[PDB]
Amino acid sequence: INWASGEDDHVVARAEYDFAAVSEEEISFRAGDMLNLALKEQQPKVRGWLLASLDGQTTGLIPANYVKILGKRKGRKTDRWYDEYHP
């Protein structure tokens, strides 16, 4: 998955809270962690959840309201989904 590694375009988000996956479908993260999100066009519709990667390889669901969306970032190859990410 090129969005997860940052090879493809992705959205960047910062974790607000700690989260432990309860299910195989979810991924764990710590408060302050930076995650890559799939673009709108690759996002599944699961109410309360977004598709993300913490480690660049595994992907899974995170609670949408546990992260702040920071903006879209170009691959190496609620309105913040549009703005570009400025580190």
Numbering used by the authors: 265 to 341, 354 to 363
What's in the article?
Our results demonstrate that the PEX13 SH3 domain indeed binds to WxxxF/Y motifs in PEX5 and that this interaction is conserved from yeast to human. Notably, the PEX5 WxxxF and FxxxF binding sites overlap and are thus competitive. The PEX5 W4 motif was identified as the strongest binder followed by W2 and W3. Of note, amongst the eight motifs in PEX5, W4 shows the highest relative binding affinity for PEX13 SH3 and the weakest interaction with the PEX14 NTD. To investigate the structural basis for the PEX5 W4 / PEX13 SH3 interaction, we determined the crystal structure of a PEX13 SH3 GS W4 chimera. In contrast to the PEX13 FxxxF motif, the binding interface is limited to the core motif driven by hydrophobic interactions and few hydrogen bonds from R183, Y185, and Y188 to the backbone or K304 sidechain. Nevertheless, polar backbone interactions involving G335 and K336 and coordination from K304 seem important since they are conserved from PEX13 FxxxF to PEX5 W4 (colored lines). Our crystal structure of PEX13 SH3 with the W4 motif reports high-resolution details for this non-canonical binding interface of an SH3 domain fold.
Import of proteins into peroxisomes depends on PEX5, PEX13 and PEX14. By combining biochemical methods and structural biology, we show that the C-terminal SH3 domain of PEX13 mediates intramolecular interactions with a proximal FxxxF motif. The SH3 domain also binds WxxxF peptide motifs in the import receptor PEX5, demonstrating evolutionary conservation of such interactions from yeast to human. Strikingly, intramolecular interaction of the PEX13 FxxxF motif regulates binding of PEX5 WxxxF/Y motifs to the PEX13 SH3 domain.
